[PDB]
Protein backbone atom coordinates (compact mmCIF):
# COMPACT_ATOMS: atom_id res chain seq x y z
CA UNK A 1 0.00 0.00 0.00
CA UNK A 2 0.88 3.69 0.00
CA UNK A 3 1.45 3.72 3.77
CA UNK A 4 4.56 1.54 3.54
CA UNK A 5 5.91 3.75 0.75
CA UNK A 6 5.37 6.89 2.84
CA UNK A 7 7.11 5.22 5.78
CA UNK A 8 10.04 4.24 3.54
CA UNK A 9 10.28 7.76 2.13
CA UNK A 10 10.33 9.34 5.59
CA UNK A 11 12.75 6.76 7.06
CA UNK A 12 15.70 9.08 6.37
CA UNK A 13 14.60 12.33 4.69
CA UNK A 14 18.09 13.26 3.48
CA UNK A 15 18.26 10.05 1.39
CA UNK A 16 15.25 10.82 -0.85
CA UNK A 17 13.14 13.61 -2.31
CA UNK A 18 11.78 14.21 1.19
CA UNK A 19 15.02 16.00 2.06
CA UNK A 20 14.58 18.74 -0.54
CA UNK A 21 10.85 18.87 0.15
CA UNK A 22 11.52 19.30 3.87
CA UNK A 23 14.02 22.08 3.18
CA UNK A 24 11.46 24.00 1.13
CA UNK A 25 8.73 23.26 3.68
CA UNK A 26 10.92 24.56 6.52
CA UNK A 27 11.59 27.72 4.52
CA UNK A 28 7.82 28.13 4.26
CA UNK A 29 7.14 27.23 7.90
CA UNK A 30 9.63 29.62 9.50
CA UNK A 31 7.34 32.49 8.43
CA UNK A 32 4.16 30.98 9.94
CA UNK A 33 2.75 31.30 13.47
CA UNK A 34 4.08 28.99 16.16
CA UNK A 35 0.78 27.05 16.22
CA UNK A 36 -1.23 26.58 13.02
CA UNK A 37 -4.03 24.19 12.10
CA UNK A 38 -3.53 22.33 8.82
CA UNK A 39 -6.01 20.65 6.50
CA UNK A 40 -4.28 17.26 6.25
CA UNK A 41 -1.49 15.46 8.10
CA UNK A 42 1.96 15.53 6.54
CA UNK A 43 2.82 11.91 7.46
CA UNK A 44 -0.40 10.02 6.80
CA UNK A 45 0.96 6.65 7.93
CA UNK A 46 2.13 8.07 11.26
CA UNK A 47 -1.18 9.87 11.82
CA UNK A 48 -3.18 6.72 11.07
CA UNK A 49 -0.97 4.56 13.29
CA UNK A 50 -1.32 7.06 16.15
CA UNK A 51 -5.10 7.14 15.75
CA UNK A 52 -6.12 9.77 13.20
CA UNK A 53 -9.21 9.10 11.10
CA UNK A 54 -10.80 10.95 8.18
CA UNK A 55 -13.97 11.94 10.01
CA UNK A 56 -15.42 15.03 11.65
CA UNK A 57 -13.94 15.94 15.03
CA UNK A 58 -10.24 15.36 14.24
CA UNK A 59 -7.77 18.24 13.97
CA UNK A 60 -4.11 18.38 12.91
CA UNK A 61 -2.01 21.21 14.35
CA UNK A 62 1.58 22.05 13.44
CA UNK A 63 3.62 23.41 16.36
CA UNK A 64 7.12 24.92 16.24
CA UNK A 65 9.45 24.85 19.25
CA UNK A 66 13.01 25.99 19.90
CA UNK A 67 15.79 23.42 20.24
CA UNK A 68 18.06 23.00 23.25
CA UNK A 69 17.57 22.82 26.98
CA UNK A 70 16.75 25.70 29.31
CA UNK A 71 18.52 28.42 31.31
CA UNK A 72 17.40 28.82 34.91
CA UNK A 73 16.51 32.33 36.14
CA UNK A 74 19.16 33.97 38.29
CA UNK A 75 18.82 33.11 41.97
CA UNK A 76 18.34 36.08 44.30
CA UNK A 77 18.91 34.62 47.76
CA UNK A 78 22.05 32.89 48.92
CA UNK A 79 22.75 29.48 47.44
CA UNK A 80 25.20 26.66 48.01
CA UNK A 81 27.51 25.78 45.09
CA UNK A 82 25.50 22.65 44.26
CA UNK A 83 22.41 24.77 43.50
CA UNK A 84 23.89 27.69 41.54
CA UNK A 85 23.81 26.13 38.06
CA UNK A 86 21.95 28.06 35.35
CA UNK A 87 23.28 27.15 31.90
CA UNK A 88 23.62 23.38 31.46
CA UNK A 89 20.05 22.39 32.28
CA UNK A 90 17.41 20.53 30.27
CA UNK A 91 13.63 20.26 30.65
CA UNK A 92 12.27 17.07 32.15
CA UNK A 93 9.44 17.10 29.59
CA UNK A 94 10.35 16.29 26.00
CA UNK A 95 9.99 18.99 23.37
CA UNK A 96 7.22 16.90 21.81
CA UNK A 97 5.31 17.06 25.10
CA UNK A 98 5.93 20.81 25.33
CA UNK A 99 4.61 21.35 21.80
CA UNK A 100 1.56 19.23 22.61
CA UNK A 101 0.88 21.41 25.65
CA UNK A 102 1.23 24.55 23.52
CA UNK A 103 -1.32 23.18 21.06
CA UNK A 104 -3.63 22.35 23.97
CA UNK A 105 -3.33 25.93 25.22
CA UNK A 106 -4.15 27.27 21.75
CA UNK A 107 -7.24 25.04 21.47
CA UNK A 108 -9.20 24.95 24.77
CA UNK A 109 -12.22 22.84 23.78
CA UNK A 110 -10.29 19.85 22.34
CA UNK A 111 -8.17 17.03 23.75
CA UNK A 112 -4.65 16.09 22.65
CA UNK A 113 -4.70 12.55 21.26
CA UNK A 114 -1.15 12.20 19.92
CA UNK A 115 1.79 13.92 18.23
CA UNK A 116 4.71 13.10 15.95
CA UNK A 117 7.96 14.64 14.73
CA UNK A 118 7.70 16.26 11.29
CA UNK A 119 11.01 18.09 10.80
CA UNK A 120 13.69 20.18 12.46
CA UNK A 121 16.47 22.58 11.49
CA UNK A 122 19.47 23.69 13.55
CA UNK A 123 17.26 26.12 15.50
CA UNK A 124 13.67 24.83 15.58
CA UNK A 125 11.79 21.54 15.77
CA UNK A 126 8.37 20.86 14.25
CA UNK A 127 5.67 18.53 15.55
CA UNK A 128 2.24 17.63 14.20
CA UNK A 129 -0.40 17.07 16.88
CA UNK A 130 -3.56 15.01 16.44
CA UNK A 131 -6.40 16.40 18.56
CA UNK A 132 -10.01 15.32 19.02
CA UNK A 133 -13.28 17.07 19.81
CA UNK A 134 -14.99 15.15 22.65
CA UNK A 135 -18.33 16.96 22.19
CA UNK A 136 -19.00 15.92 18.58
CA UNK A 137 -21.66 13.22 18.01
CA UNK A 138 -19.51 11.55 15.34
CA UNK A 139 -16.66 11.22 17.84
CA UNK A 140 -19.06 9.96 20.52
CA UNK A 141 -20.55 7.30 18.24
CA UNK A 142 -17.14 5.76 17.49
CA UNK A 143 -16.27 3.11 20.13
CA UNK A 144 -12.56 3.35 19.25
CA UNK A 145 -12.23 6.94 20.49
CA UNK A 146 -15.45 7.57 22.44
CA UNK A 147 -13.59 6.96 25.72
CA UNK A 148 -12.25 10.53 25.61
CA UNK A 149 -15.81 11.78 26.18
CA UNK A 150 -15.73 10.63 29.81
CA UNK A 151 -15.20 13.23 32.51
CA UNK A 152 -11.98 11.82 33.97
CA UNK A 153 -10.15 12.31 30.62
CA UNK A 154 -9.83 16.10 30.95
CA UNK A 155 -6.42 17.70 30.58
CA UNK A 156 -4.85 14.34 29.76
CA UNK A 157 -1.82 15.96 28.13
CA UNK A 158 -1.34 18.27 31.12
CA UNK A 159 -1.49 15.34 33.54
CA UNK A 160 0.83 13.30 31.32
CA UNK A 161 -1.37 10.61 29.76
CA UNK A 162 -0.29 10.87 26.10
CA UNK A 163 2.45 8.78 24.50
CA UNK A 164 5.02 11.52 25.13
CA UNK A 165 3.80 11.83 28.71
CA UNK A 166 4.18 8.10 29.30
CA UNK A 167 7.67 8.18 27.80
CA UNK A 168 8.58 11.10 30.06
CA UNK A 169 7.22 9.30 33.11
CA UNK A 170 9.10 6.11 32.22
CA UNK A 171 6.05 3.88 31.80
CA UNK A 172 7.63 2.16 28.77
CA UNK A 173 9.97 0.16 31.05
CA UNK A 174 9.01 -2.91 33.08
CA UNK A 175 10.83 -5.06 35.60
CA UNK A 176 14.34 -4.16 36.70
CA UNK A 177 14.99 -0.43 36.73
CA UNK A 178 11.29 0.53 36.74
CA UNK A 179 10.77 0.16 40.49
CA UNK A 180 10.18 3.88 41.15
CA UNK A 181 8.07 4.64 38.05
CA UNK A 182 4.79 2.99 39.10
CA UNK A 183 2.00 3.64 39.89
CA UNK A 184 3.10 7.29 39.58
CA UNK A 185 6.11 9.55 39.93
CA UNK A 186 4.57 11.22 42.98
CA UNK A 187 3.58 7.88 44.53
CA UNK A 188 7.30 7.02 44.77
CA UNK A 189 8.28 10.30 46.46
CA UNK A 190 8.90 11.79 43.02
CA UNK A 191 12.40 10.30 42.92
CA UNK A 192 12.08 7.79 40.07
CA UNK A 193 12.80 10.50 37.48
Amino acid sequence: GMYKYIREAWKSPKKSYVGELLKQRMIKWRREPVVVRIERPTRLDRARALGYQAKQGYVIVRVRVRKGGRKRPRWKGGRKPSKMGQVKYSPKKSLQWIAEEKAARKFPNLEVLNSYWVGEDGMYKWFEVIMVDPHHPVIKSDPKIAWIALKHHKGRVFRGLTSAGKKGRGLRNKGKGAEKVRPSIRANEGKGK
Binding site: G1, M2, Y5, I6, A9, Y17, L21, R40, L44
Partner: protein, 122 residues
Protein backbone atom coordinates in the same frame (compact mmCIF):
# COMPACT_ATOMS: atom_id res chain seq x y z
CA UNK B 1 4.31 25.89 -8.87
CA UNK B 2 4.53 22.41 -10.35
CA UNK B 3 4.93 19.71 -7.66
CA UNK B 4 8.15 17.73 -7.85
CA UNK B 5 6.40 14.42 -8.55
CA UNK B 6 5.29 15.60 -12.01
CA UNK B 7 7.86 14.32 -14.50
CA UNK B 8 6.63 16.08 -17.65
CA UNK B 9 4.09 18.55 -19.04
CA UNK B 10 0.87 17.21 -20.57
CA UNK B 11 -1.31 19.23 -22.98
CA UNK B 12 -4.94 20.01 -22.23
CA UNK B 13 -6.14 17.81 -25.09
CA UNK B 14 -4.25 14.79 -23.74
CA UNK B 15 -5.48 15.44 -20.20
CA UNK B 16 -9.10 15.64 -21.38
CA UNK B 17 -8.60 12.47 -23.43
CA UNK B 18 -7.35 10.72 -20.29
CA UNK B 19 -10.40 11.95 -18.37
CA UNK B 20 -12.71 10.66 -21.11
CA UNK B 21 -10.91 7.31 -21.05
CA UNK B 22 -11.43 7.13 -17.28
CA UNK B 23 -15.13 7.89 -17.70
CA UNK B 24 -15.61 5.27 -20.42
CA UNK B 25 -13.68 2.67 -18.41
CA UNK B 26 -15.91 3.39 -15.41
CA UNK B 27 -19.02 3.06 -17.58
CA UNK B 28 -18.12 -0.15 -19.44
CA UNK B 29 -15.08 -1.72 -17.78
CA UNK B 30 -13.05 -1.91 -14.57
CA UNK B 31 -11.32 0.92 -12.72
CA UNK B 32 -9.72 1.38 -9.30
CA UNK B 33 -10.21 4.68 -7.48
CA UNK B 34 -7.94 5.98 -4.76
CA UNK B 35 -4.20 5.92 -4.15
CA UNK B 36 -4.28 2.71 -2.09
CA UNK B 37 -6.27 0.75 -4.67
CA UNK B 38 -4.20 2.12 -7.56
CA UNK B 39 -0.96 1.18 -5.80
CA UNK B 40 -2.27 -2.33 -5.14
CA UNK B 41 -3.32 -2.73 -8.78
CA UNK B 42 0.06 -1.48 -10.02
CA UNK B 43 1.89 -3.86 -7.68
CA UNK B 44 -0.25 -6.76 -8.88
CA UNK B 45 0.44 -5.67 -12.47
CA UNK B 46 -3.19 -5.49 -13.60
CA UNK B 47 -3.72 -1.80 -14.38
CA UNK B 48 -3.25 -0.87 -18.04
CA UNK B 49 -3.01 2.87 -17.34
CA UNK B 50 -2.60 5.18 -14.34
CA UNK B 51 -4.01 8.71 -14.02
CA UNK B 52 -2.71 11.09 -11.35
CA UNK B 53 -3.86 14.51 -10.15
CA UNK B 54 -1.58 17.55 -10.29
CA UNK B 55 -2.90 19.17 -7.09
CA UNK B 56 -2.25 16.47 -4.47
CA UNK B 57 -1.05 17.94 -1.17
CA UNK B 58 0.95 16.57 0.58
CA UNK B 59 2.56 14.86 -2.43
CA UNK B 60 3.80 11.90 -0.37
CA UNK B 61 0.51 10.23 -1.34
CA UNK B 62 1.49 9.97 -5.02
CA UNK B 63 5.26 10.51 -4.81
CA UNK B 64 5.87 6.78 -5.42
CA UNK B 65 3.48 6.19 -8.33
CA UNK B 66 5.79 7.37 -11.17
CA UNK B 67 8.80 5.31 -10.03
CA UNK B 68 6.57 2.28 -9.41
CA UNK B 69 4.93 2.58 -12.83
CA UNK B 70 8.32 2.96 -14.51
CA UNK B 71 9.59 -0.14 -12.70
CA UNK B 72 6.51 -2.18 -13.64
CA UNK B 73 6.28 -0.83 -17.23
CA UNK B 74 2.86 0.80 -16.82
CA UNK B 75 1.91 4.08 -18.56
CA UNK B 76 1.05 6.95 -16.21
CA UNK B 77 -0.39 10.35 -17.13
CA UNK B 78 -1.25 13.53 -15.23
CA UNK B 79 -4.52 15.49 -15.07
CA UNK B 80 -4.93 18.98 -13.55
CA UNK B 81 -8.14 18.72 -11.50
CA UNK B 82 -8.28 16.25 -8.61
CA UNK B 83 -11.97 16.96 -8.03
CA UNK B 84 -12.77 16.47 -11.72
CA UNK B 85 -10.76 13.24 -11.69
CA UNK B 86 -12.87 12.00 -8.80
CA UNK B 87 -16.09 13.06 -10.50
CA UNK B 88 -15.08 11.21 -13.67
CA UNK B 89 -14.19 8.18 -11.55
CA UNK B 90 -17.79 8.43 -10.33
CA UNK B 91 -17.35 9.01 -6.59
CA UNK B 92 -18.69 12.11 -4.82
CA UNK B 93 -15.26 13.09 -3.43
CA UNK B 94 -11.98 14.12 -5.02
CA UNK B 95 -9.64 11.28 -6.04
CA UNK B 96 -5.86 11.67 -6.11
CA UNK B 97 -5.29 8.72 -8.46
CA UNK B 98 -7.09 6.23 -10.70
CA UNK B 99 -6.17 3.04 -12.54
CA UNK B 100 -7.84 1.37 -15.53
CA UNK B 101 -7.67 -2.43 -15.41
CA UNK B 102 -10.19 -3.31 -18.13
CA UNK B 103 -10.25 -0.74 -20.97
CA UNK B 104 -13.78 -1.73 -21.96
CA UNK B 105 -14.74 0.48 -24.91
CA UNK B 106 -11.78 2.88 -24.59
CA UNK B 107 -9.07 0.52 -25.84
CA UNK B 108 -7.99 2.75 -28.72
CA UNK B 109 -8.06 5.84 -26.50
CA UNK B 110 -5.86 4.24 -23.84
CA UNK B 111 -3.47 2.88 -26.47
CA UNK B 112 -3.08 6.34 -28.02
CA UNK B 113 -2.64 7.93 -24.59
CA UNK B 114 0.11 5.42 -23.79
CA UNK B 115 1.83 6.10 -27.12
CA UNK B 116 1.73 9.86 -26.55
CA UNK B 117 3.08 9.43 -23.01
CA UNK B 118 5.91 7.30 -24.40
CA UNK B 119 6.72 10.02 -26.92
CA UNK B 120 6.66 12.76 -24.27
CA UNK B 121 8.71 11.01 -21.58
CA UNK B 122 7.34 7.47 -21.06
Amino acid sequence: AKPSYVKFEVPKELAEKALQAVEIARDTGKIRKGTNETTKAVERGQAKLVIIAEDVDPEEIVAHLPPLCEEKEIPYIYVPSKKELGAAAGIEVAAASVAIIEPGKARDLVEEIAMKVKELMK
